[PDB]
Design a protein around this ligand. Structure first.
Ligand SMILES: CCCC(=O)Nc1n[nH]c2c(F)c(F)c(-c3ccccc3)cc12
Length: 289
Protein backbone atom coordinates (compact mmCIF):
# COMPACT_ATOMS: atom_id res chain seq x y z
CA UNK A 1 0.00 0.00 0.00
CA UNK A 2 0.84 3.72 -0.53
CA UNK A 3 0.35 4.72 3.15
CA UNK A 4 3.05 2.23 4.32
CA UNK A 5 6.85 2.35 4.07
CA UNK A 6 8.18 -1.24 4.30
CA UNK A 7 11.12 -1.64 6.68
CA UNK A 8 11.77 -5.41 6.08
CA UNK A 9 10.22 -8.83 5.28
CA UNK A 10 9.61 -10.51 8.65
CA UNK A 11 8.16 -13.90 7.62
CA UNK A 12 5.88 -16.16 5.58
CA UNK A 13 2.38 -16.94 6.81
CA UNK A 14 -0.02 -19.71 5.79
CA UNK A 15 -1.73 -17.23 3.36
CA UNK A 16 0.86 -14.57 2.49
CA UNK A 17 4.10 -12.63 3.18
CA UNK A 18 4.44 -10.66 6.46
CA UNK A 19 6.33 -7.36 6.47
CA UNK A 20 7.40 -4.93 9.18
CA UNK A 21 6.05 -1.55 8.01
CA UNK A 22 5.64 2.08 9.10
CA UNK A 23 2.42 4.06 8.51
CA UNK A 24 3.24 7.40 6.78
CA UNK A 25 0.42 9.54 8.32
CA UNK A 26 0.49 8.14 11.93
CA UNK A 27 4.15 6.97 12.17
CA UNK A 28 2.75 3.74 13.72
CA UNK A 29 4.98 0.61 13.37
CA UNK A 30 2.83 -2.37 12.25
CA UNK A 31 2.96 -5.94 10.81
CA UNK A 32 1.60 -5.93 7.21
CA UNK A 33 0.26 -9.23 5.67
CA UNK A 34 -0.23 -9.33 1.83
CA UNK A 35 -2.61 -12.10 0.60
CA UNK A 36 -2.39 -13.34 -3.05
CA UNK A 37 -16.73 -11.67 -0.50
CA UNK A 38 -17.79 -14.17 2.26
CA UNK A 39 -14.12 -14.22 3.47
CA UNK A 40 -14.04 -10.34 3.56
CA UNK A 41 -17.27 -10.38 5.68
CA UNK A 42 -15.76 -12.88 8.22
CA UNK A 43 -12.44 -10.96 8.45
CA UNK A 44 -14.10 -7.49 8.82
CA UNK A 45 -15.92 -8.92 11.92
CA UNK A 46 -12.47 -9.71 13.49
CA UNK A 47 -11.79 -5.89 13.91
CA UNK A 48 -14.29 -6.01 16.85
CA UNK A 49 -12.87 -8.97 18.84
CA UNK A 50 -10.30 -7.08 20.94
CA UNK A 51 -8.48 -8.54 24.02
CA UNK A 52 -4.97 -7.87 25.56
CA UNK A 53 -3.91 -11.49 24.71
CA UNK A 54 -5.15 -11.32 21.04
CA UNK A 55 -2.94 -9.56 18.37
CA UNK A 56 -4.99 -6.49 17.29
CA UNK A 57 -6.36 -6.33 13.70
CA UNK A 58 -5.97 -2.59 12.95
CA UNK A 59 -7.33 -2.54 9.36
CA UNK A 60 -8.50 -4.65 6.38
CA UNK A 61 -7.59 -3.36 2.85
CA UNK A 62 -9.03 -5.13 -0.24
CA UNK A 63 -7.58 -3.69 -3.52
CA UNK A 64 -6.32 -4.78 -7.01
CA UNK A 65 -6.39 -8.63 -6.56
CA UNK A 66 -4.87 -8.36 -3.02
CA UNK A 67 -6.01 -8.59 0.63
CA UNK A 68 -3.97 -6.48 3.11
CA UNK A 69 -4.25 -7.18 6.87
CA UNK A 70 -2.73 -4.47 9.14
CA UNK A 71 -1.69 -5.93 12.53
CA UNK A 72 -0.20 -4.80 15.88
CA UNK A 73 3.61 -5.49 15.87
CA UNK A 74 5.49 -7.67 18.45
CA UNK A 75 9.33 -8.24 18.30
CA UNK A 76 9.53 -12.05 18.86
CA UNK A 77 7.56 -15.35 18.48
CA UNK A 78 7.45 -18.36 20.94
CA UNK A 79 9.19 -20.74 18.47
CA UNK A 80 12.42 -18.61 18.41
CA UNK A 81 12.21 -18.01 22.20
CA UNK A 82 11.93 -21.84 22.78
CA UNK A 83 14.98 -22.40 20.47
CA UNK A 84 17.02 -19.63 22.22
CA UNK A 85 16.13 -21.24 25.64
CA UNK A 86 16.82 -24.91 24.53
CA UNK A 87 19.97 -25.33 26.71
CA UNK A 88 18.55 -24.27 30.14
CA UNK A 89 14.77 -24.36 29.53
CA UNK A 90 12.12 -21.66 30.02
CA UNK A 91 11.64 -21.18 33.85
CA UNK A 92 8.42 -22.76 35.26
CA UNK A 93 6.99 -19.36 36.53
CA UNK A 94 7.19 -17.99 32.91
CA UNK A 95 5.70 -21.18 31.27
CA UNK A 96 2.83 -20.81 33.85
CA UNK A 97 2.31 -17.07 33.13
CA UNK A 98 2.36 -17.72 29.34
CA UNK A 99 -0.16 -20.62 29.68
CA UNK A 100 -2.43 -18.48 31.97
CA UNK A 101 -2.42 -15.53 29.47
CA UNK A 102 -3.01 -17.88 26.48
CA UNK A 103 -6.02 -19.48 28.26
CA UNK A 104 -7.49 -15.95 28.91
CA UNK A 105 -7.25 -15.12 25.18
CA UNK A 106 -8.91 -18.48 24.29
CA UNK A 107 -11.68 -17.95 26.95
CA UNK A 108 -12.47 -14.50 25.40
CA UNK A 109 -12.61 -15.71 21.73
CA UNK A 110 -14.51 -18.92 22.57
CA UNK A 111 -17.12 -16.77 24.50
CA UNK A 112 -17.82 -14.98 21.16
CA UNK A 113 -17.95 -18.41 19.34
CA UNK A 114 -14.63 -17.74 17.49
CA UNK A 115 -11.99 -20.51 17.32
CA UNK A 116 -8.39 -20.39 16.01
CA UNK A 117 -8.01 -24.01 14.63
CA UNK A 118 -4.24 -23.66 13.86
CA UNK A 119 -2.33 -22.79 17.10
CA UNK A 120 1.46 -23.32 16.91
CA UNK A 121 4.55 -21.69 18.63
CA UNK A 122 5.19 -19.70 15.39
CA UNK A 123 1.85 -17.74 15.76
CA UNK A 124 2.26 -16.95 19.53
CA UNK A 125 4.01 -13.56 19.94
CA UNK A 126 5.89 -12.12 22.94
CA UNK A 127 7.16 -8.69 24.14
CA UNK A 128 9.72 -7.42 26.78
CA UNK A 129 6.86 -6.77 29.32
CA UNK A 130 6.11 -10.51 29.85
CA UNK A 131 3.00 -10.47 27.60
CA UNK A 132 2.04 -13.25 25.10
CA UNK A 133 -0.55 -12.89 22.31
CA UNK A 134 -2.33 -15.15 19.78
CA UNK A 135 -1.81 -14.11 16.08
CA UNK A 136 -3.93 -15.17 12.98
CA UNK A 137 -7.11 -15.78 15.10
CA UNK A 138 -10.18 -16.27 12.86
CA UNK A 139 -8.28 -16.59 9.52
CA UNK A 140 -8.93 -20.42 9.37
CA UNK A 141 -12.73 -19.86 9.55
CA UNK A 142 -12.45 -17.41 6.60
CA UNK A 143 -10.07 -19.42 4.29
CA UNK A 144 -9.75 -22.94 5.77
CA UNK A 145 -6.44 -24.64 6.61
CA UNK A 146 -4.60 -25.89 3.47
CA UNK A 147 -2.20 -28.88 3.15
CA UNK A 148 0.58 -26.46 2.01
CA UNK A 149 1.15 -22.69 2.52
CA UNK A 150 1.35 -20.11 -0.39
CA UNK A 151 5.18 -20.89 -0.59
CA UNK A 152 4.33 -24.71 -0.81
CA UNK A 153 5.67 -25.25 2.77
CA UNK A 154 3.97 -28.19 4.61
CA UNK A 155 1.46 -26.89 7.22
CA UNK A 156 2.40 -28.57 10.60
CA UNK A 157 0.20 -31.44 11.89
CA UNK A 158 1.89 -31.55 15.37
CA UNK A 159 -0.82 -29.59 17.25
CA UNK A 160 -3.87 -31.03 15.39
CA UNK A 161 -6.75 -32.41 17.55
CA UNK A 162 -7.68 -36.16 17.04
CA UNK A 163 -11.32 -35.40 16.08
CA UNK A 164 -9.93 -33.34 13.10
CA UNK A 165 -7.62 -36.23 12.05
CA UNK A 166 -10.58 -38.68 12.38
CA UNK A 167 -12.72 -36.72 9.85
CA UNK A 168 -15.24 -34.72 11.96
CA UNK A 169 -16.97 -31.90 9.96
CA UNK A 170 -17.95 -29.82 13.01
CA UNK A 171 -15.03 -28.57 15.12
CA UNK A 172 -15.69 -27.22 18.58
CA UNK A 173 -13.62 -24.80 20.75
CA UNK A 174 -12.00 -27.99 22.27
CA UNK A 175 -9.65 -28.10 19.18
CA UNK A 176 -7.71 -25.02 20.50
CA UNK A 177 -7.49 -26.53 24.03
CA UNK A 178 -5.78 -29.65 22.53
CA UNK A 179 -3.19 -27.52 20.56
CA UNK A 180 -2.39 -25.41 23.65
CA UNK A 181 -1.83 -28.60 25.73
CA UNK A 182 0.62 -29.86 23.06
CA UNK A 183 2.44 -26.43 23.30
CA UNK A 184 2.44 -26.59 27.15
CA UNK A 185 4.12 -30.05 27.04
CA UNK A 186 6.75 -28.77 24.52
CA UNK A 187 7.75 -25.70 26.70
CA UNK A 188 8.24 -28.06 29.70
CA UNK A 189 10.22 -30.86 27.90
CA UNK A 190 12.04 -28.76 25.18
CA UNK A 191 10.82 -31.38 22.62
CA UNK A 192 7.62 -31.64 20.48
CA UNK A 193 4.96 -33.92 22.08
CA UNK A 194 3.63 -35.48 18.82
CA UNK A 195 5.96 -34.54 15.85
CA UNK A 196 3.94 -36.30 13.09
CA UNK A 197 5.09 -36.20 9.44
CA UNK A 198 1.79 -37.40 7.89
CA UNK A 199 -1.85 -37.60 9.06
CA UNK A 200 -1.54 -41.31 9.90
CA UNK A 201 1.88 -40.80 11.64
CA UNK A 202 0.34 -37.95 13.73
CA UNK A 203 -2.71 -40.05 14.75
CA UNK A 204 -0.56 -43.16 15.61
CA UNK A 205 1.88 -40.98 17.68
CA UNK A 206 -1.14 -39.69 19.74
CA UNK A 207 -2.38 -43.35 20.07
CA UNK A 208 1.09 -44.70 21.18
CA UNK A 209 1.22 -42.21 24.15
CA UNK A 210 -2.47 -41.75 25.13
CA UNK A 211 -3.71 -45.24 24.14
CA UNK A 212 -5.85 -46.18 21.12
CA UNK A 213 -9.33 -44.62 21.86
CA UNK A 214 -12.43 -46.86 22.15
CA UNK A 215 -16.18 -46.56 22.95
CA UNK A 216 -15.25 -46.57 26.70
CA UNK A 217 -13.16 -43.34 26.69
CA UNK A 218 -14.76 -41.69 23.61
CA UNK A 219 -18.49 -42.46 22.83
CA UNK A 220 -19.04 -42.44 19.03
CA UNK A 221 -15.31 -42.72 18.02
CA UNK A 222 -15.78 -46.03 16.05
CA UNK A 223 -18.53 -44.27 13.97
CA UNK A 224 -16.27 -41.32 12.87
CA UNK A 225 -15.54 -40.96 9.09
CA UNK A 226 -11.79 -41.84 9.04
CA UNK A 227 -11.92 -44.38 11.89
CA UNK A 228 -10.74 -47.90 10.90
CA UNK A 229 -11.22 -51.08 13.06
CA UNK A 230 -7.75 -52.13 11.67
CA UNK A 231 -6.02 -49.35 13.78
CA UNK A 232 -3.34 -50.99 16.07
CA UNK A 233 -4.43 -51.20 19.73
CA UNK A 234 -1.79 -49.41 21.90
CA UNK A 235 -1.81 -49.12 25.71
CA UNK A 236 -1.89 -45.71 27.48
CA UNK A 237 1.49 -44.64 28.88
CA UNK A 238 1.87 -43.23 32.43
CA UNK A 239 1.77 -39.38 32.46
CA UNK A 240 4.90 -39.18 34.74
CA UNK A 241 6.94 -40.45 31.69
CA UNK A 242 5.12 -37.98 29.29
CA UNK A 243 6.22 -34.62 30.81
CA UNK A 244 9.02 -35.10 33.43
CA UNK A 245 9.77 -33.32 35.83
CA UNK A 246 6.44 -31.31 35.81
CA UNK A 247 4.58 -31.41 39.21
CA UNK A 248 1.19 -33.15 39.88
CA UNK A 249 -0.86 -29.89 39.42
CA UNK A 250 0.70 -29.39 35.96
CA UNK A 251 0.26 -33.08 35.05
CA UNK A 252 -3.44 -32.99 36.16
CA UNK A 253 -4.12 -29.86 34.01
CA UNK A 254 -2.27 -31.33 30.97
CA UNK A 255 -4.27 -34.64 31.21
CA UNK A 256 -7.58 -32.65 31.16
CA UNK A 257 -6.48 -30.54 28.11
CA UNK A 258 -5.56 -33.82 26.27
CA UNK A 259 -8.86 -35.73 26.86
CA UNK A 260 -9.91 -37.69 23.73
CA UNK A 261 -13.63 -36.80 24.08
CA UNK A 262 -14.12 -33.12 23.03
CA UNK A 263 -17.05 -32.91 25.56
CA UNK A 264 -14.84 -34.09 28.46
CA UNK A 265 -11.82 -31.89 27.45
CA UNK A 266 -11.46 -28.90 29.89
CA UNK A 267 -12.72 -25.48 28.68
CA UNK A 268 -10.42 -22.39 28.67
CA UNK A 269 -12.76 -20.92 31.40
CA UNK A 270 -12.46 -24.00 33.70
CA UNK A 271 -8.65 -24.25 33.04
CA UNK A 272 -8.16 -20.71 34.50
CA UNK A 273 -9.62 -22.00 37.85
CA UNK A 274 -7.27 -25.09 38.01
CA UNK A 275 -5.08 -25.32 41.22
CA UNK A 276 -1.94 -25.09 38.92
CA UNK A 277 -2.74 -21.36 38.67
CA UNK A 278 -2.83 -20.69 42.48
CA UNK A 279 0.75 -19.24 42.52
CA UNK A 280 0.78 -17.50 39.03
CA UNK A 281 2.92 -14.35 38.74
CA UNK A 282 3.94 -12.23 35.73
CA UNK A 283 7.78 -12.51 35.26
CA UNK A 284 9.60 -10.88 32.33
CA UNK A 285 11.70 -12.83 29.74
CA UNK A 286 15.37 -12.05 28.90
CA UNK A 287 15.00 -10.93 25.22
CA UNK A 288 17.82 -9.34 23.20
CA UNK A 289 16.37 -7.58 20.12
C1 LIG B 1 9.79 -12.65 15.22
C2 LIG B 1 8.33 -12.20 15.16
C3 LIG B 1 8.17 -11.01 14.21
C4 LIG B 1 6.74 -10.92 13.67
O1 LIG B 1 6.45 -11.47 12.61
N1 LIG B 1 5.89 -10.21 14.44
C5 LIG B 1 4.59 -9.97 14.20
N2 LIG B 1 3.98 -8.89 14.68
N3 LIG B 1 2.76 -8.96 14.46
C6 LIG B 1 2.46 -10.07 13.78
C7 LIG B 1 1.25 -10.59 13.32
F1 LIG B 1 0.11 -9.88 13.46
C8 LIG B 1 1.21 -11.84 12.70
F2 LIG B 1 0.02 -12.31 12.29
C9 LIG B 1 2.38 -12.59 12.53
C10 LIG B 1 2.31 -13.90 12.00
C11 LIG B 1 2.87 -14.96 12.72
C12 LIG B 1 2.81 -16.27 12.24
C13 LIG B 1 2.14 -16.54 11.05
C14 LIG B 1 1.55 -15.50 10.34
C15 LIG B 1 1.62 -14.18 10.82
C16 LIG B 1 3.59 -12.08 13.04
C17 LIG B 1 3.63 -10.80 13.62
Amino acid sequence: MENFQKVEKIGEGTYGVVYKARNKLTGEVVALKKIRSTAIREISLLKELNHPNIVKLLDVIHTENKLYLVFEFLHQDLKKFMDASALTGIPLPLIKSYLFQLLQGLAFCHSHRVLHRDLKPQNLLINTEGAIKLADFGLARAFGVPVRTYTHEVVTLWYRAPEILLGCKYYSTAVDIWSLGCIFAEMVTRRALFPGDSEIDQLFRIFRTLGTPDEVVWPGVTSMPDYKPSFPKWARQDFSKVVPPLDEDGRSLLSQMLHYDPNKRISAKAALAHPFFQDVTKPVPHLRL
